[PDB]
Amino acid sequence: IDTFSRTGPLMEAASYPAWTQQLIQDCSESKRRVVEHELYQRMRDNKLSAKVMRQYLIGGWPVVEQFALYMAQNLTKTRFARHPGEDMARRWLMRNIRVELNHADYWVHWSRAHGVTLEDLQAQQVPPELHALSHWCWHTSSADSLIVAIAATNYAIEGATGEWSALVCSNGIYAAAFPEEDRKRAMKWLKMHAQYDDAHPWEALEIIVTLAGLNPTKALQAELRQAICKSYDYMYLFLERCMQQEKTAVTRERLA
Template identity: 55%
Template sequence: MGDAFVRQGDLQDIESYPEWAQEMVAACAASRERVTSHELFHRMREARLDEAQTHAFLVSGWPVVEQFPQYMALNLLKVQYGRTRGHDLARRFLIRNIRVEQNHVDHWIEWSAASGVSRDELFEGKVPLETHALGHWCWHTCERDALAAAMAATNYAIEGATGDWSAFVCSSDVYENSFEPDVRAKAMKWLKLHARYDDSHPWEALEIVCAIMGTDPTQRGVALIRNNVLKSYEYMRLTLDHVLSMRHAGARPDKAVVQMPALKRA
């Protein structure tokens, strides 16, 4: 496990974390950048996504958004109160934020409705096969991997990249103004919460990961953390690539998808 880690510096300063964590973040930076600077978000920011792309993005993202509180609940099952400081931090973080993530589910539904995507279209689960990988990966790591590795994949990697791209989309008012005034606030709430409020969540998750792993973890342990973070970024990118490919589709994605079986529940 290595020596215990207790953060001394600022939460959002990478130099406040152990050297191994700094190296991990640097090693994953290019993969994260391919997500956060993806062309899809440039088009969203400029309100240039067409109907098929918008529908594909919201429907494809729904399973992960809807299941995110469940991923966190799976991780909460791994926590042993009083075992280590890292487990105690994780317990408080997960219990506090499961309710927050549930509220985000409601906001995604409002965003979808304002974009012409009904609740039925979200709930039917007709998600393109190419975009299912991220949701299956999140469920797998949270069900099977150790607490630190699973939280690194979800609460650090996915929430962190999501905060970055949400902030980018919200840095201009073009997309916001593309909605009618009477639905604009509800349409933008998910994005604005992630652009502002969620900013500290990935850093809190990184602190928990470091508190569990310590300052001198095994090479195998560090490799698992790094690989999980990279997988999350790459699965996010695959989803975005597929959504952007709908550019000339001319049909909404639910016309040509396969109904996936329900995910296994623990």
């Protein structure tokens, strides 16, 4: 039968099959170097240059803006009661498209708190390293099977985002640095992803496991692993590019 039904708690890796725990293990270094990135330890501490913060906010906009579109494209692949896990996916995507309703507006507000306008977001004047993640996300959402594109997006990106957003919010410095009257509106995107988002990536994982079952082929497993690590590696490419600019910007001002 090969059919998966979770018994243990949603949030624990041990509630899933061995192949799923292996997938988590094989992806863990790719994830760690994003979710512990120096860029985020700096952001947490209010250290980032104006130039880099602006690049970060412009750069990350398209994935945010397009996020419910990735989901829409995956929902479009589904057919009612056709395969195990496919109904769960369809329902989940229908619920979670709505959960994204205001998230783009919250990014616009975060951005504005750093002097980045809607016009600047739309203009997308940032280096190409910063756009690669959105292109990959559209590509897999458009062309890959649902299970792979959900893994790339709702598992990989959302999971990483919950963790880096929490790191940014973890010691109160970044938030206290905003004036009080501006803070709630500026911090809203981060608080929504740092606090409220815990179960989401695990719900996506459970769907992916239900789709794949207890014994997926090695090839399917490799496809999931590669798609997940692609998402993490594009986040890492974006962060590395930002830090190279940070190092330049800060150096110029030390020497001046």
